[PDB]
Design a protein around this motif. Sequence first.
Motif, short mmCIF file in Angstrom:
data_model
loop_
_atom_site.label_atom_id
_atom_site.label_comp_id
_atom_site.label_asym_id
_atom_site.label_seq_id
_atom_site.Cartn_x
_atom_site.Cartn_y
_atom_site.Cartn_z
N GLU A 174 -19.85 4.85 -29.87
CA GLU A 174 -20.42 6.19 -29.83
C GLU A 174 -21.76 6.23 -30.55
O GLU A 174 -21.89 5.73 -31.67
CB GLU A 174 -19.45 7.22 -30.41
CG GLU A 174 -18.20 7.41 -29.56
CD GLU A 174 -17.22 8.39 -30.15
OE1 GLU A 174 -17.42 8.82 -31.30
OE2 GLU A 174 -16.23 8.74 -29.47
N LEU A 224 -24.33 8.31 -32.39
CA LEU A 224 -24.38 9.57 -33.13
C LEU A 224 -25.18 9.41 -34.42
O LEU A 224 -25.38 8.30 -34.92
CB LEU A 224 -22.95 10.09 -33.39
CG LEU A 224 -21.89 9.28 -34.15
CD1 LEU A 224 -21.95 9.38 -35.67
CD2 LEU A 224 -20.50 9.65 -33.64
N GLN A 244 -20.97 23.47 -35.32
CA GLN A 244 -20.60 22.09 -35.63
C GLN A 244 -21.05 21.70 -37.03
O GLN A 244 -20.37 20.93 -37.72
CB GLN A 244 -21.18 21.13 -34.59
CG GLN A 244 -20.60 21.30 -33.20
CD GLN A 244 -19.11 21.01 -33.15
OE1 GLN A 244 -18.63 20.07 -33.78
NE2 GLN A 244 -18.38 21.82 -32.40
N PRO A 283 -13.91 21.00 -32.83
CA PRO A 283 -13.23 21.31 -31.56
C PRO A 283 -12.01 20.42 -31.34
O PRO A 283 -12.07 19.21 -31.55
CB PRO A 283 -14.31 21.05 -30.51
CG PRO A 283 -15.24 20.08 -31.15
CD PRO A 283 -15.25 20.43 -32.61
N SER A 284 -10.91 21.04 -30.94
CA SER A 284 -9.66 20.33 -30.69
C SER A 284 -9.28 20.31 -29.21
O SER A 284 -8.18 19.87 -28.87
CB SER A 284 -8.52 20.95 -31.51
OG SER A 284 -8.80 20.88 -32.90
N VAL A 302 -15.70 20.88 -25.44
CA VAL A 302 -16.66 19.83 -25.09
C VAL A 302 -17.36 20.17 -23.78
O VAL A 302 -18.57 19.95 -23.63
CB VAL A 302 -15.94 18.47 -25.03
CG1 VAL A 302 -16.87 17.35 -24.55
CG2 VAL A 302 -15.34 18.12 -26.39
N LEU A 304 -19.92 22.69 -24.49
CA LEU A 304 -21.06 22.00 -25.10
C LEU A 304 -21.95 21.33 -24.06
O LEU A 304 -23.18 21.42 -24.14
CB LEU A 304 -20.56 20.97 -26.11
CG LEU A 304 -21.62 20.05 -26.75
CD1 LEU A 304 -22.68 20.79 -27.53
CD2 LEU A 304 -20.94 19.00 -27.62
N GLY A 308 -21.05 13.89 -32.02
CA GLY A 308 -19.76 13.40 -32.46
C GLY A 308 -18.61 14.35 -32.23
O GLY A 308 -17.55 14.16 -32.84
N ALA A 309 -18.80 15.39 -31.41
CA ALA A 309 -17.72 16.31 -31.07
C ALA A 309 -16.60 15.60 -30.32
O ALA A 309 -15.42 15.94 -30.48
CB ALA A 309 -18.26 17.48 -30.26
N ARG A 310 -16.97 14.65 -29.44
CA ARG A 310 -15.98 13.88 -28.69
C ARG A 310 -15.09 13.06 -29.62
O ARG A 310 -13.90 12.89 -29.35
CB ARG A 310 -16.70 12.98 -27.68
CG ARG A 310 -15.79 12.10 -26.83
CD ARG A 310 -16.57 11.27 -25.83
NE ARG A 310 -17.46 10.31 -26.47
CZ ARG A 310 -18.33 9.55 -25.81
NH1 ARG A 310 -18.43 9.65 -24.49
NH2 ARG A 310 -19.10 8.70 -26.47
N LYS A 311 -15.66 12.54 -30.72
CA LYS A 311 -14.87 11.83 -31.73
C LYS A 311 -13.80 12.73 -32.34
O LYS A 311 -12.63 12.36 -32.41
CB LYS A 311 -15.79 11.29 -32.84
CG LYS A 311 -15.03 10.59 -33.96
CD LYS A 311 -15.96 10.03 -35.03
CE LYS A 311 -16.82 8.89 -34.51
NZ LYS A 311 -16.00 7.72 -34.07
N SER A 312 -14.22 13.90 -32.84
CA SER A 312 -13.29 14.90 -33.40
C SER A 312 -12.23 15.32 -32.39
O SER A 312 -11.07 15.54 -32.76
CB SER A 312 -14.07 16.12 -33.89
OG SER A 312 -13.20 17.16 -34.28
N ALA A 313 -12.61 15.48 -31.12
CA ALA A 313 -11.65 15.80 -30.07
C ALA A 313 -10.65 14.67 -29.86
O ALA A 313 -9.46 14.92 -29.62
CB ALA A 313 -12.37 16.13 -28.77
N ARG A 314 -11.12 13.42 -29.92
CA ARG A 314 -10.25 12.27 -29.73
C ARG A 314 -9.25 12.12 -30.88
O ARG A 314 -8.08 11.79 -30.64
CB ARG A 314 -11.09 11.00 -29.58
CG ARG A 314 -10.29 9.75 -29.24
CD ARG A 314 -11.18 8.53 -29.14
NE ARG A 314 -12.12 8.63 -28.02
CZ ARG A 314 -11.83 8.30 -26.77
NH1 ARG A 314 -10.63 7.84 -26.45
NH2 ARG A 314 -12.75 8.44 -25.82
N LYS A 315 -9.71 12.32 -32.12
CA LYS A 315 -8.81 12.25 -33.27
C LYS A 315 -7.75 13.34 -33.22
O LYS A 315 -6.56 13.08 -33.45
CB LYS A 315 -9.60 12.34 -34.58
CG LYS A 315 -10.66 11.27 -34.75
CD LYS A 315 -10.08 9.87 -34.64
CE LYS A 315 -11.17 8.81 -34.78
NZ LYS A 315 -12.07 8.78 -33.60
N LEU A 316 -8.15 14.57 -32.91
CA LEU A 316 -7.23 15.69 -32.85
C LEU A 316 -6.75 15.93 -31.42
O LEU A 316 -5.61 15.61 -31.08
CB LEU A 316 -7.88 16.96 -33.40
CG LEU A 316 -8.23 16.96 -34.89
CD1 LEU A 316 -8.94 18.24 -35.28
CD2 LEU A 316 -6.98 16.76 -35.74
#
Lengths: 285, 335, 221, 234, 14, 56
Positions: free
Chosen positions: A151, A153, A238, A244-245, A250, A253, E6-14
């Motif tokens: 990733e 970032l 953010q 975001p869960s 996403v 976004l 890094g939103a995709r990272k947080s989504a993947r973890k949770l």
Amino acid sequence: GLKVTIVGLYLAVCVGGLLGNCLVMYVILRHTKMKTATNIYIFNLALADTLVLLTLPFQGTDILLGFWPFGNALCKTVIAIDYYNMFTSTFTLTAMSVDRYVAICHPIRALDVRTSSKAQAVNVAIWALASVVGVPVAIMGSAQVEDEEIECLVEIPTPQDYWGPVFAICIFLFSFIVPVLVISVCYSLMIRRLRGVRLLSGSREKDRNLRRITRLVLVVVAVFVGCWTPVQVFVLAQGLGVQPSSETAVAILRFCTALGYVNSCLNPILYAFLDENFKACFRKF
Amino acid sequence: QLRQEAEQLKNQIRDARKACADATLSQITNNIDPVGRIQMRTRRTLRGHLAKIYAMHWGTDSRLLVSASQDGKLIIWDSYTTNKVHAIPLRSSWVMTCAYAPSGNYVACGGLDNICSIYNLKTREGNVRVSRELAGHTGYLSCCRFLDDNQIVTSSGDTTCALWDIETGQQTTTFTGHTGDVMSLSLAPDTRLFVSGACDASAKLWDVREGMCRQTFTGHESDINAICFFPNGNAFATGSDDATCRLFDLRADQELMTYSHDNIICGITSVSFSKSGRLLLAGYDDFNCNVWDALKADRAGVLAGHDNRVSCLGVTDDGMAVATGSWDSFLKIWN
Amino acid sequence: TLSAEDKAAVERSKMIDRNLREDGEKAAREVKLLLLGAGESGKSTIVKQMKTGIVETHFTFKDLHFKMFDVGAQRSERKKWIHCFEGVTAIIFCVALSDYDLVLAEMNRMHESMKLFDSICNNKWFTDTSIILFLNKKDLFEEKIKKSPLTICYPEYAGSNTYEEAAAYIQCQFEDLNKRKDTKEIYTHFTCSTDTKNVQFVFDAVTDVIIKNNLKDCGLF
Amino acid sequence: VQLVESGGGLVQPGGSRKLSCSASGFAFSSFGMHWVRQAPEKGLEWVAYISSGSGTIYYADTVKGRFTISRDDPKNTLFLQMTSLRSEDTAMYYCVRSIYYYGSSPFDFWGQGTTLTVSAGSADIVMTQATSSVPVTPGESVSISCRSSKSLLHSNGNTYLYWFLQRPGQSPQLLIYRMSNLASGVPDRFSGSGSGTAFTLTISRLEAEDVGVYYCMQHLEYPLTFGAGTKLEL
Amino acid sequence: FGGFTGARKSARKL
Amino acid sequence: IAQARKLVEQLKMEANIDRIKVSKAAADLMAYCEAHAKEDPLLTPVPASENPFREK
């Protein structure tokens, strides 16, 4: 095929914006053959827009592949070119608004102040100020592969919970609060000053042309503020540590990111094409 | 009685001129093969003027050229190297003519101030210094031409032309036969005689030595803005505001051929010949300069590429190239 | 591939180009206005209040340089020189007001001035150029209009013999001649013994023309 | 047109001195300036040159770096600063005005010159004169020849050869520039001619004033090397 | 802007 | 009055001048054009080696 639709939208917006920007750049650079400050500002804006639209082909592949295979160097180049050219575009638009305000409100001192070389020097200053912000963010940004997924970032220095929100708030304030306020105040004073002028208010037809001008200014401000408001809001959210869960967040976004790039691709149509001098050049050939 | 005598003499001269018009040059030139269409391409573009160009003249070596503009500047250019040789600041910005010496030592310039200023290009100090300012005219100067280093014929808007010497500063000869403002002059190659065009739709042939009028040409419907001698020296061509050029003879004392086209209604600002006299370049007000041929009188080319009214043009003394100045603040060279 | 002399010539040409660019930048910042008007109108009086071939007068007011050109001396054809003055901020136009009943051998001087106004206003070179009309004399016109009616000058005139009505009527007659009202606005002022008022009015009109020129340069208008 | 040199005096080795050239009666602002040195028993040698506006500055290879040249345009004064003086730098210095444009005559005026006395290139064109002295009598023509180790005939058609005359106890004078055109103030008697490397100056009907050393110069490349000098005699 | 959050990272973890 | 007399005198002097026929001057003009036709660089496009105006 949500991701497929998003990537296709990215391609379509990128192709249309690149075509328009290359036409504006080439025509202003050689076809017009006129040296004025406004042409230099429009050329700088179009070049910044082209450099912004270079970023999208790599982001689309990132979304399709689900990871970043380009590497660390390309990740840093993409992040630097995108944030740098964004900031350059924003400040260039602010400089154009200030230039028009100085031209119209204070016509006696407008003569010497407005010059091609002086405008070019102001543009060089804008690029230098963009570089000052650009370089540390470019340094921090990298590609991480903890569990076989790469990733690209930006890295927040430890502690993240303190440095990250301050970083996001500073980016939000400089990118959004100052240019919108300066543009709105200067354009409002400009519209009131134009109403003050006896020439515009002389007759009903001239008043109608003044209506057209005021509506055009209001449309430009409304399009800019409306397009860039959701991206700044989501980035500030953010920054505040909201996480975001869901996949839907996403997706919001992504769509809002594309909505942000809609204004960037729209900018030559908003500025160059409506400009009467460019229209005069267009009619000839 | 005097008006009646003038009418009968004019009728006599009209009949005598019609008695020698048995043939026409249009039918004589039918036998010659038509020249190929002259397709010229701009070899140079000169930049540095900001206001509009009013006059130009080539040097005798076909390398230096002068131009005048409303920024107060008279600029002398090298055409080959596309650089600037001299920049002279004028006291009066409203300059309408310039001329270059046959020796290349002096330049002259006249304007709305009714003064002909002469500048010396070769000084020991190295700076350009005004030599003599002539103010003997009650009207704006339209043109000036250098007979030699010491003699200069000028033309002015007070319906007269004057021959001056530069050492004393007094007008040596005065030419007063025109009824309208005099617009242009042209010298013969051997400097024996000159022609003048004026706003009364007539062109006059004067004489340098005796100082009296030799011939009077009355064939136009509008005023004459441009005049040029044929390189042989026994004919000349005109240019007027009714979109036509006319060829007059010093021998037959009348018109020979008419250069006109139906789709042209604009005014003619400048006229010049080729070294052989086969071509005739005419600057029109349609933003392009049309190249005709003298003998056949059909169009042989077009020089486009100006953004405003073409005001002047000139062929070099050896004929290698032709320069055109215009109201677009540029100066182009074609070959 | 370039000799030392040729390179020095190129350097000299670059220096000439730089000096010409500086001279052009200095020249662009100055306002130039043509001064038209009939002979006996009194343009020289206006010149003296604000302060052979061509008369140029330059003055500085509120950090803005004005050059005034006077073409009155030349009695030649007016068309031949009416195209060099195409670029101009405004045209001052001074008309004598006290010569309504004066007859100079044209029946009326007023017609001899309206003719000039029509000739200048309805011109291709000055389609968008503004016109600043000055009525030179007011008190003498008041004394005359008291002593003599205006019915001689104009065949059909209203009953009102008051000075204000005659002034307004003459102003309307001059403004009427403009056949393109939208593109050009004519400003009519009454000349007074205060120099500051006249110079201020000219400055305000020039400021409005500069506002229009800036609007054209930006492209917003 | 006057040039007055000053600031020259006898010094001990290792001293630093400033030369001042005062131009009067002409437009010093648009003229490029040279410094040229003459040894007592050798010919004239070019030292340095500064162009108009100080855009381009050139120096001789031997004196490069140590000597620095500056010009003051409002005061019309030329300054040369010399440091680390040695035994070789004992010469007579000339301040020279030259303007370069098409049809111009450079080196038209030569300064009087000051004196400096000290109490102690492969690419350069070696200009060679085959003769050191020609004894002649007044009235008869004389030809003096100069030769070059490189072709001076440039592509544009100009042949950069300049002819100078230096009468004893006088400044040099330009006779013919670009080996064709006679310079102003010079009689029609002198005439330059020649092809390629070969160069022949001809002086028909010689007079008493023609006595002096003759120097040929090239101008094709920036390290301007002069000639040895043909001392014409009676 | 905002793509590399890094939103995709947080989504993947949770 | 006097100006009209001078105009009549000028007409008399103009009438006194002899005028050659148009055809002979036309022949002279055509012969002069033919003689210098080859010399004329504009009429017939010169080779680029002779032509001193090139891409410099």
